[PDB]
Design a protein around this ligand. Structure first.
Ligand SMILES: CCCCCC/C=C/CCCCCCCC(=O)OC[C@H](O)CO
Ligand SMILES: CCCCCC/C=C/CCCCCCCC(=O)OC[C@H](O)CO
Ligand SMILES: CCCCCC/C=C\CCCCCCCC(=O)OC[C@@H](O)CO
Ligand SMILES: CCCCCC/C=C\CCCCCCCC(=O)OC[C@@H](O)CO
Ligand SMILES: CCCCCC/C=C\CCCCCCCC(=O)OC[C@H](O)CO
Ligand SMILES: CCCCCC/C=C\CCCCCCCC(=O)OC[C@H](O)CO
Ligand SMILES: CCCCCC/C=C\CCCCCCCC(=O)OC[C@H](O)CO
Ligand SMILES: CCCCCC/C=C\CCCCCCCC(=O)OC[C@H](O)CO
Ligand SMILES: CCCCCC/C=C\CCCCCCCC(=O)OC[C@H](O)CO
Ligand SMILES: CCCCCC/C=C\CCCCCCCC(=O)OC[C@H](O)CO
Length: 448
């Protein structure tokens, strides 16, 4: 007896991530619209450009938090307590939004989910590898199955949560996200005690006695310096919300910038720079689906007969549809890796180029077919299949996605009804050209 040929413990972790992704993307599907609503009632005193910027920097901090969660679990608390307490924080963050509060609850909700996702997301994937020995060949199949559960939750969540918001309002809809995470906790807690190795209730590489102090010193210097920067900012008058967002943008971009300049000072690392740039730029476009495309859907689409948040379901839908195809394709000369990044960046560019057409053809004061966004997501997910689809590279994928959203925090403020065609054309064409450049550089990168 198995779970699709895999250890029974996989079903638990399958369902665990399935409901966490449910809570996350269900929230992402309506959070921007919710901020619009808080703005329209005068409760929240920001612009839509700022609200869009918040969404992007929100995502950036979540991925950045994922780079640290692996460390905390492996060295301090253990992977299983990390997943559990990570989930509790995630749940609380959604409960905060379900409460009878307004804009005041936003920062509290955001902080909880960032810390929570940081603990849970990288360690659930870790616990998946736990299910297998070193020798096991089923590993790639199990992770593929595990990925499928991730996409399932991301698919049904905007459908359920989005419809709930339409029927019973925002507070009820956010509570469904909280309930979704709660279900994941029940299955994880009681299912884990049956199938998970008790060895991972504790850290696998616990701090040696002499390691405690320097780690404590290192963290303290980071917090103090960060606190110091904020102090100076408020002194010189850079203390509006766009200022703090720019600070986090700088921090998010500085982290890979420093690590590169660190390692650079044989030099094949230099050859990874274009790949990392290509990764950042792709994630920038892909992550704008929940921000820019979510805005386009709500303002420019004939979606009068269905919840407009449902458009967020297209991303994991096309992933699930494309996956068995590419699974077959990579088994049936297979193109190199820098080539995949170059072509993947092109498809992302075409997705934005396509969106420039309806505005250029019909104008931007009317409403267009929902099929335009359908074709756009189909293009960028096609590009995803080439670039994105575990170990130590998990950090770089967390980093690349984090930097992209940080870049988005700046870029999405430029998007509006007046700048629609220009926004989609330039960045659309811009990504295609850099995809062409990467093709020219593709041969050198191979062999390094
Ligand atoms: C294989 C599927 C291919 C997917 C097709 C994607 C589109 C490709 C070319 C059109 C993009 C640029 C559209 C032109 C935008 C443009 O003309 O901007 C000025 C405008 O006229 C000002 O009003
Ligand atoms: C399959 C296509 C293969 C790739 C072909 C690439 C096509 C690019 C067309 C857009 C170029 C820009 C033209 C429109 C720019 C535009 O709208 O500018 C407004 C004004 O500058 C606002 O400042
Ligand atoms: C990828 C192959 C299939 C699609 C190829 C893309 C072909 C055309 C896309 C770009 C042009 C679309 C037409 C937009 C309208 C326009 O330009 O307004 C002209 C301006 O003077 C206003 O009066
Ligand atoms: C066998 C699968 C091969 C996969 C190739 C699929 C490629 C593209 C999918 C269909 C895209 C065509 C749509 C463009 C033509 C169009 O919009 O004209 C509008 C017309 O309807 C007016 O009413
Ligand atoms: C939030 C309600 C969801 C249901 C929770 C059950 C109620 C109480 C559990 C005891 C306290 C929690 C202690 C958990 C610490 C922990 O590491 O859990 C790893 C777990 O054994 C892996 O399956
Ligand atoms: C920790 C236990 C597990 C977690 C359980 C999930 C959390 C809350 C569930 C109920 C939410 C009810 C929310 C009530 C909606 C509300 O406040 O009012 C709407 C508004 O008035 C309609 O217009
Ligand atoms: C628990 C969630 C995160 C907690 C924030 C801590 C972050 C930085 C402080 C570093 C030292 C803290 C770790 C405690 C050291 C410790 O547990 O001792 C091990 C060993 O048993 C002694 O040799
Ligand atoms: C890896 C550590 C992080 C990297 C080191 C960072 C060093 C200094 C931070 C830049 C200044 C922060 C202040 C930015 C705020 C800002 O730009 O203000 C505009 C706003 O329009 C004013 O209202
Ligand atoms: C596997 C990747 C597949 C490639 C994806 C890209 C293909 C087509 C783009 C969307 C279709 C154009 C939009 C059609 C709009 C339409 O149906 O016209 C009625 C509406 O009322 C007019 O606005
Ligand atoms: C509307 C008119 C616009 C014209 C559109 C033309 C589209 C593609 C042509 C350039 C392709 C260059 C790609 C190959 C160049 C090259 O040197 O590639 C070596 C590389 O090492 C191989 O992997």
């Amino acid at each position: 007896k198995t779970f699709f040929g895999q250890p029974l413990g996989l079903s638990t972790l399958f369902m665990t991530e399935m409901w966490e992704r449910f809570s996350y993307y269900g929230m992402r599907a309506i959070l921007l619209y919710y901020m619009w609503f808080l703005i329209s009632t005068g409760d929240l005193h920001i612009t839509r450009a700022t609200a869009a910027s918040i969404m992007a920097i929100y995502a950036s901090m979540v991925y950045l938090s994922g780079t640290i969660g692996g460390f905390v679990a492996d060295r301090i608390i253990g992977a299983r307590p990390a997943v559990f307490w990570g989930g509790v924080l995630i749940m609380l963050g959604h409960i905060v939004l379900a409460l009878p509060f307004g804009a005041s609850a936003l920062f509290g909700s955001i902080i909880l989910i960032i810390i929570g996702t940081g603990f849970l997301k990288p360690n659930v994937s870790t616990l998946v590898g736990t299910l297998y020995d070193e020798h096991d060949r089923r590993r790639d199949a199990g992770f593929s199955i595990f990925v499928f559960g991730i996409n399932l939750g991301a698919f049904i969540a905007p459908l359920i949560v989005g419809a709930a918001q339409e029927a019973a309002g925002y507070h009820v809809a956010f509570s469904l996200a909280a309930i979704g995470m709660f279900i994941g906790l029940l299955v994880y807690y009681f299912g884990g005690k049956k199938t998970l190795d008790p060895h991972y209730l504790r850290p696998t590489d616990p701090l040696a006695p002499e390691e405690v102090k320097p780690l404590l010193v290192k963290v303290s210097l980071a917090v103090a310096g960060f606190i110091a920067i904020i102090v100076v900012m408020n002194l010189v008058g850079w203390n509006s919300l766009p200022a703090y967002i720019n600070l986090l943008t700088i921090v998010a971009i500085a982290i890979p910038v420093f690590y590169f300049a660190w390692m650079i000072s044989h030099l094949r690392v230099v050859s990874y720079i274009p790949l990392f740039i290509a990764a950042v730029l792709f994630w920038a476009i892909e992550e704008q689906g929940s921000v820019v495309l979510a805005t386009f859907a709500a303002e420019r689409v004939d979606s009068s007969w269905f919840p407009v948040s449902w458009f967020q379901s297209l991303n994991p839908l096309f992933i699930m549809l494309y996956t068995p195809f590419f699974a077959w394709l990579w088994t049936a000369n297979q193109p190199s890796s820098p080539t995949k990044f170059a072509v993947g960046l092109m498809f992302a560019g075409l997705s934005f180029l396509l969106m420039a057409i309806p505005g250029a053809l019909y104008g931007t004061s009317g409403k267009v077919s929902p099929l335009w966004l359908v074709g756009s997501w189909a293009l960028v997910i096609l590009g995803e299949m080439l670039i994105s689809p575990n170990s130590q590279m998990m950090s770089m994928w967390f980093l690349s996605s984090s930097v992209g959203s940080a870049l988005n925090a700046q870029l999405v403020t430029l998007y509006n009804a007046k700048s629609e065609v220009a926004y989609f054309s330039y960045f659309g064409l811009g990504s295609v050209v850099l995809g062409i450049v990467l093709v020219f550089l593709s041969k050198r990168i191979q062999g390094l």
